């Protein structure tokens, strides 16, 4: 299979996920 298939899947999984988690964390810290 594509050697970049796993990398593309991983980055697709990760980047929006870390974005959303960062937004939620900097929301919840605030009152």
């Amino acid at each position: 299979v594509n050697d970049l298939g796993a990398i593309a899947t991983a980055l697709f999984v990760f980047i929006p996920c870390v974005f959303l988690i960062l937004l939620y964390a900097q929301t919840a810290s605030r009152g």
Binding site: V1, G5, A6, T9, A10, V13
Partner: peptide, 28 residues
Amino acid sequence: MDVIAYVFILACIIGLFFFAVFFREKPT
């Protein structure tokens, strides 16, 4: 190794279900 990618995404989905069910902020 694709199997590992599929299984990891699936396990993350199940964990998300667990947290979304038992740890949602209380509606009010």
